[PDB]
Structures are given as structure tokens and as C-alpha cells.
Ligand SMILES: O=C(NC1CCN(S(=O)(=O)C[C@H]2CC[C@H](NCCCC(F)(F)F)CC2)CC1)c1cc(C2CC2)on1
Ligand SMILES: Nc1ncnc2c1ncn2[C@@H]1O[C@H](CSCC[C@H](N)C(=O)O)[C@@H](O)[C@H]1O
Ligand SMILES: [Mg+2]
């Protein structure tokens with residue numbers, strides 16, 4: 003018995019609404035992807051199948067592009083990799099855009115696979131394309147993706163009889179652009195891109211009543227507020243650390259809509275997000291383009307070097323509540339954790355705690371993860387009362403956003419028991 007149902011909204015296309023009253027933390031839907039792939043930066047760093055990082059990965063011998071954590075993952079991935087393998091090998095050394103590799107997997111799944119549970123409420127065929135809202139520049143970009151797909155897939159798909167009935171590649175890429183999900187690992191690093199057509203029914207809010215979280219490729223949809231019968235379910239499509247102007251640009255560019263929510267009408271939190279000297283944070287925002295690229299490719303030493311030059315600059319500095327400063331602290335923290343620089347990681351992480359309380363109101367999985375990271379760093383440094391407070395706060399958030407079905411909650415329970423045993427021996 004589903005707790006959610008598809009419906010036709012008055013002015014947002016189709017949507018999802020509650021069939022029963024919902025409480026924070028309630029699991030509403032869970033889904034594997036219709037199709038997914040590792041993303042550009044994480045290719046060869048994480049396993050193609052389970053999206054977990056490993057010090058050494060085994061490569062597919064035929065294409066040498068797909069890489070796996072284990073013989074189990076390589077073999078289990080073979081049915082969904084078999085046809086793309088010949089295309090990837092034929093295209094070497096050229097690697098396709100993520101969207102092109104993704105749509106290849108969509109096509110093979112729809113041609114060769116049984117009907118997917120991911121499409122229970124809504125299918126790839128049903129997805130919004132927004133084609134009549136596309137500007138000419140966007141249509142041109144989609145045409146180039148179509149031609150890139152035809153080149154990449156030529157070994158496996160030569161004509162329309164090898165595509166699903168009435169399949170239009172331009173329309174398919176339009177759907178991919180507006181309906182791709184960024185798959186994040188347990189630490190909230192972007193590691194993949196996938197299509198989850200039933201989850202695509204969720205419309206956007208900058209102050210949503212639901213949240214999604216990834217456990218490998220698996221997606222969990224949970225309520226994060228009380229929700230009444232008939233009430234529309236929403237998620238936030240975007241990073242919370244964005245001004246209303248930034249959200250406006252991305253929602254127009256990628257999703258072809260103008261957001262009418264209260265936060266956008268009132269520029270909610272914009273002024274607090276942009277405190278400090280504008281010339282300074284404009285420079286930091288510029289530097290973050292490279293920092294974000296380095297982080298996406300797991301280049302932690304390079305990330306840390308650039309972040310330290312900002313955090314410890316000889317020149318003017320920013321308040322930690324400035325969102326570009328905050329992003330630099332976040333990246334520096336994550337780099338230090340991955341490099342084993344645990345004292346420095348804790349310094350940066352502790353500084354983010356109050357800004358995160360302000361910018362992630364309610365129960366948000368990203369703040370849950372951040373607080374867990376800080377609590378774990380404090381546990382390792384022997385600060386048991388401080389660690390316990392943060393681990394308990396992380397649990398209060400993550401019991402709602404992640405839940406028992408997410409493996410990170412089991413990890414958190416072990417940290418809480420270890421911290422508690424230390425306190426009791428003191
Ligand atoms: O992919 C979808 N949403 C995303 C929203 C964002 N999250 S997140 O949980 O906040 C994790 C993010 C936290 C920030 C992190 N970036 C930090 C970079 C900072 C810099 F630049 F300084 F380096 C990246 C991960 C993931 C899911 C989606 C699609 C749809 C379709 C339209 C239906 O809905 N939702
Ligand atoms: N808050 C919002 N206001 C207006 N349109 C929205 C919206 N959130 C999502 N959408 C629409 O939904 C698309 C994302 S997919 C969400 C389901 C979609 N409404 C459908 O009918 O299939 C966006 O590109 C936009 O067309
Ligand atoms: Mg349509």
C-alpha cells in the first residue's frame with residue numbers, strides 16, 4: 003500500500019501527493035535507478051556498480067573504462083555494461099559526456115530489460131521534456147548531444163529499429179537534462195548520475211517537505227515535515243548554499259521554471275549569505291570553480307592547498323557565514339579527512355557548525371552528515387562529551403533524513419555506543 007500517488011497539479015505539470023498523513027522520517031518510496039553511471043570526476047575512483055571508493059579498482063578488460071571494487075561487482079554489472087562496453091571501446095580514447103553514457107544505458111535497459119520497478123509511478127516515456135520552453139541555444143546544445151550519442155553508440159545502435167518504439171533522441175536528451183539525479187555517496191561527494199522516473203514526479207521547493215538520500219545507487223524518499231492527506235510532496239532540487247538569484251538561474255537554465263515560493267519572493271537568507279566584502283567573496287566564488295572541479299576528481303591535496311590560501315590568506319578574509327567562505331571550509335574539511343589531517347579537519351568542521359544550523363533548517367541530510375563528521379572527529383580526538391552531543395544531534399537529524407534503511411545510520415549507532423562506553427568509564 004503506497005503512501006503517495008501521482009496527480010495533475012494546477013500549474014506545475016504532474017506531481018506527487020500524500021495518500022495518508024505523514025510524519026517526519028517516514029519512508030515514502032525507495033528505488034533503484036532505471037539507469038545510472040559513474041560521473042566524470044569519480045570515474046576510475048569509485049566502483050562503477052556500487053559507487054564506493056577503493057584504493058585499487060579492477061578494470062573491465064574489454065573496454066578498460068569500467069572499473070570495479072570486486073569481481074562480484076564486475077560480474078554483477080556485466081548485463082547492464084555488455085552493450086556499452088563495445089561502444090566505449092570503439093570510442094577510445096574519447097569518453098562521452100555523462101548524459102550520453104546515461105542515455106545509452108536507458109536505451110539498453112528499455113530494449114533488453116524487463117519493466118523496471120523504478121517506473122512504477124511514472125516512466126521515462128512520461129517524463130517532462132519542457133521542449134516548448136527551450137531557447138534556441140538550448141536546442142542547439144541538445145542537437146549536439148544527439149549527434150554525440152549517434153557517434154558513441156554506432157556499434158550497438160545503427161537505426162531506429164534498435165531504439166524503443168517512437169523513440170526520439172532529441173526529446174530523450176531534453177528529458178535527461180531536466181530529470182537527472184546527482185547520486186551522492188555517504189559523505190555527500192557527488193559520484194554518479196541516474197534516472198529515477200517515479201521519483202521524478204516530485205516538484206521543487208526551496209523549503210521542501212520531503213528529502214531524498216542515496217545509499218549507493220539506491221534512493222530513499224522520506225518526509226521531513228508533517229504532511230496532510232492530499233498535500234503535494236516536494237524536494238529541493240538544489241544545493242541549499244545558494245542565493246535566490248543563483249537558484250533562479252539554475253531553475254531557469256536546467257528546469258525551465260520560475261520559482262514562486264516564499265523564500266524566492268523575499269530573498270530569504272540572501273543578505274546573510276553574502277556578508278563580508280563583495281570584492282573578496284567575488285574572488286572566492288571565482289576560485290571555487292577550480293576548487294569544486296578538483297574536489298569532484300578527488301584531488302584532495304590540491305583542494306586543500308587552494309582552500310588554505312583563502313582560509314589563511316594574508317589578504318582580506320570573509321565571515322564563516324558567507325556561503326563562499328563556508329564552501330571553502332567544507333572542501334578543506336573534506337580534504338583533510340580524506341588525507342588523515344584530523345586535527346585540521348576538526349578546526350574547519352567546527353567552524354561550519356553554526357552556519358550549517360542557519361542554512362539547513364529543520365532536518366536536512368547534508369547537515370546530518372556534516373554534524374556526524376564533526377562528532378566523529380571529536381570522538382577520535384577524545385572529546386567524548388562534545389562528540390556525544392554532536393553524534394546525538396546527527397542521529398536526531400539522520401533518523402529523519404536517512405532512517406534505518408540507510409547503512410550510514412548503523413555506522414552512526416556504533417559511534418554513539420563507542421562514545422557512550424568511553425563516557426561511562428570516565
Ligand atoms: O539531483 C538532484 N538534487 C540534488 C540536490 C543536491 N543534493 S544534496 O543532498 O544537497 C547533496 C549535495 C551537497 C552539496 C555538494 N556540492 C558542494 C560543492 C561546493 C563547491 F562548489 F564549493 F565545491 C553536492 C551534493 C543532491 C541531490 C535532483 C534532481 C531532481 C530532478 C528534478 C527532479 O530532483 N533532485
Ligand atoms: N516549483 C515548481 N514550479 C513550477 N514548475 C515546477 C516546479 N517544480 C518542478 N516543476 C516542473 O517540473 C519539472 C521537473 S520534473 C517534476 C515533475 C514534473 N512536474 C512532471 O510533470 O513530470 C520542471 O522542469 C518544471 O517543469
Ligand atoms: Mg510531456
Ligand SMILES: [Mg+2]
Pocket residue numbers: 132
Ligand atoms: Mg509544459
Ligand SMILES: [Zn+2]
Pocket residue numbers: 049050051052053054070071072075
Ligand atoms: Zn562495487
Ligand SMILES: [Zn+2]
Pocket residue numbers: 062063064065066067068083087088
Ligand atoms: Zn567493458
Ligand SMILES: [Zn+2]
Pocket residue numbers: 207208261262263264265266267
Ligand atoms: Zn523558491
